[PDB]
């Protein structure tokens, strides 16, 4: 018996966490918009949507945010088999973006199961959208200082330098005011089967928050 | 550390097989010719060529046949770990495949790390080429069934009952002689860097055989 | 970094289920008294106490029952390290028992780790102590068969063939009524800490009844 | 299926390494001779021919230096099982030990599995060699402070601080030329079946040597 992962299992409830792989050079080849761009970020969740739809397994949910999905499963693929559920996800994920994007050469994500107690589910998620949020503004403030005639290594040093707070005022100073970009930049995107349509909301609540807590709790059951 | 299997790794010299999921319905769509299809097994060795020439991996070569590629490594990516070799080998695997066919709906492999000691490497692809033969003939077995105006279901029974010498002499009964169709049906396609060009390599000789094993020699080092 | 498996780890709450290797056999020669011996049995609960008390880890409490003992973990050991938690307590009971016994040759356990969701926690107890006396029941009937001049091929032949009723009926006319035997042989012993003593229970109720339930609730918390 | 390790298993040629937990604290109380006892060296020993001779189990041979013990394994026992094999192994040695040393408070080893190409089995155990000679000089040093009326501390401090020549040197002017020490304090002691008797070699040669490398390469064969 070589195959010796092959038996490798978990349980349920987990997280399944693709990300893409090596993405910021390989969206830099292509001319995607800098720091966002809506037609990448519209290509990730219909990803995850056709996931959803057409892979034959049934996560709850799909949340996504940057170069990444994560699928909320109650009800485990492939006997919870870990090689299983990861190499086949992450390469329906490939296959899906690639159709997507109409890509020429191609990509990869990479995945991994995140093993969790029901009662730690909101938050993960909860973990994940701070992530997004601290993404957000560092993806704004970079391109700022690129945008002020600066360097690539100058950029992440005096990034590293300051906090959110000077960031948001440096952003505020040239014209971009944070609080009123689009909200899918800021706290990503849920995409969920209801009753059955599948549907890509573009405007969720902040998570940790009186409208986000019984919303997750809805999504979850 | 909720990642439990993020740190799982293995050793060299490992093998990774990744083996498309469920390609009977998903690409039946096309029109492909049965039981065999240049235009997908020409695909699928283009698949196997662009991983070694992109992918940024360096495999010493894959191993195509069916829905299936091997690709043998001794210098490990990713440190080894498995959960990242797995999804990211099996979703660029996915991309690239998703590319070279045009498709319009997406498709997935599975993977999985076979561990090995180098003694055992031959072996390995011989069982694997072993596969082939077996995939070979019971691929012309249904296809003769299906002109023979057989169920589906039918022609598992009587397939799975009897052993190839009988079907052998049924195919040449229905007017097919295994032994004129070429080699790479029975056999599969060697991809590997050679004297230095990435080729392909379709007449590739039985690995168990006395020009088989200098060959895999060579090809191992 | 040839410890390859060194890194796989887990989450609580887990449950660690040892037992006895071989016990049959070493059971057999050194002259225990058959099917139950209580001094074999308070040198299993001792053993739980003894490794609650000084092992320098923290269960929540110990379940016992034939040659096997499972521990209930919130707060994982070793980083939930599976293979220093199962080694290093599989290594520790050996010793513990050994000690207890006074035993001139060497015991093995095995163990082995148990990954549930705290809901399920009642459940999994539920279903060994269902083992218990599965094991009980089994135990008295064979004794009984090999009492009445019975080769022991002939005696697990029969057993098989008759249910639980049955067994009940030929045990209760030979004078064994098996409602009136020791608590701790047919559903178990519980050993745990309370408010710090380690206290043993050898009179536990039946844990899915109107009793249990809120017992093992309010052992678990 | 729960039990989601219960089914991970490696492939020959493994090393089981088992290494005695906290052996410092546990086995302090009884008084043995520091910083090298010829007891508990020969309980070590003891109980490493112990399981060659009654575990069930076929290791090739062991090799034992401080407090821990490995075991080379060509036949896989438990099919390769990594839990059962770890759990059982520290189980016995625990147990073995135990009976070996007379211990009225129980002890623990951990385990761990080696995964290993052949080609670098005498490696593994030049490099668990080499460990011992840095156990050896350090025990010592150690030794030294603490009749030089050192604390514990203070003595952990200069040990860091300084390389093995002025080492050497320090424990020369105190009185200890470490040459003329017994070989198995630096260099361990081998456990294996010979010309067939279980015999414990006490003066074994360096393995990366003229003399050690075809003695190693009798040993694995
Ligand atoms: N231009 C552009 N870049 C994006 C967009 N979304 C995500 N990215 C890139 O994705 C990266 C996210 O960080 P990572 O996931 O660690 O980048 P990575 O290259 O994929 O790193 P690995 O996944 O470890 O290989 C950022 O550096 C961005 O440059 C987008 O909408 N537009
Ligand atoms: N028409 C056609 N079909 C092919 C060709 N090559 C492989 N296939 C199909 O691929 C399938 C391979 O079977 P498997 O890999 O064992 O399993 P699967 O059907 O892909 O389903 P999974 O278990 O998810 O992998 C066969 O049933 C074939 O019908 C081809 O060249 N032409
Ligand atoms: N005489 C006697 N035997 C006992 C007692 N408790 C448990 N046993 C033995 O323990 C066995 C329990 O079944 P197993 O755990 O599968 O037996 P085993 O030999 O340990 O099998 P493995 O653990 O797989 O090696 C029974 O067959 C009993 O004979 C006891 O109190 N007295
Ligand atoms: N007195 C005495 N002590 C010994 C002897 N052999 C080994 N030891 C002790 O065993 C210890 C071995 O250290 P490690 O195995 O690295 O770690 P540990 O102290 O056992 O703690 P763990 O990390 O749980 O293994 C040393 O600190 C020694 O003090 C001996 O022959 N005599
Ligand atoms: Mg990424
Ligand atoms: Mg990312
Ligand atoms: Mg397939
Ligand atoms: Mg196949
Ligand atoms: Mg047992
Ligand atoms: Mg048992
Ligand atoms: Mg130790
Ligand atoms: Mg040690």
Redesign the interface.
């Known amino acids: ?13 987990v997280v399944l966490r ?1 990300d893409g ?2 993405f910021k050079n390989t969206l830099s080849g292509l001319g995607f918009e800098k720091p966002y761009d809506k037609t990448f970020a519209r290509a990730m969740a219909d990803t995850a949507e ?1 996931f959803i739809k ?3 397994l049934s996560p709850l949910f799909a949340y996504t945010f940057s170069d990444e999905i994560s699928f909320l499963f109650t009800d485990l693929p492939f ?2 088999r ?3 559920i ?14 997507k994007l109409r ?18 589910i909101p938050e ?1 998620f909860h973990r994940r959208q701070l992530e997004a949020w601290r993404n957000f503004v560092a993806s704004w403030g970079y391109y700022a200082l690129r945008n002020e005639g600066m360097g690539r290594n100058e950029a992440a040093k005096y990034l590293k330098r300051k906090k959110e707070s000077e960031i948001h005022e440096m952003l505020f100073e040239r014209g971009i005011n944070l609080a009123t970009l689009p909200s899918w930049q800021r706290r990503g995107v849920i995409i969920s089967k209801e009753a059955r349509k599948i549907t890509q909301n573009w405007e969720i609540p902040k998570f940790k928050s009186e409208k986000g807590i019984p919303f997750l709790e809805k999504l979850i059951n």
């Open positions: 018996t070589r195959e010796i992962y092959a038996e490798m299992r978990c349980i349920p409830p693709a792989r090596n056709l057409k892979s034959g006997d919870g870990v090689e299983k990861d190499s086949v996800v992450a390469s329906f994920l490939g296959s899906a973006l690639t159709i890509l020429e050469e191609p990509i990869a994500f990479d995945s991994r199961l995140v093993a969790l107690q029901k009662e730690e993960y």
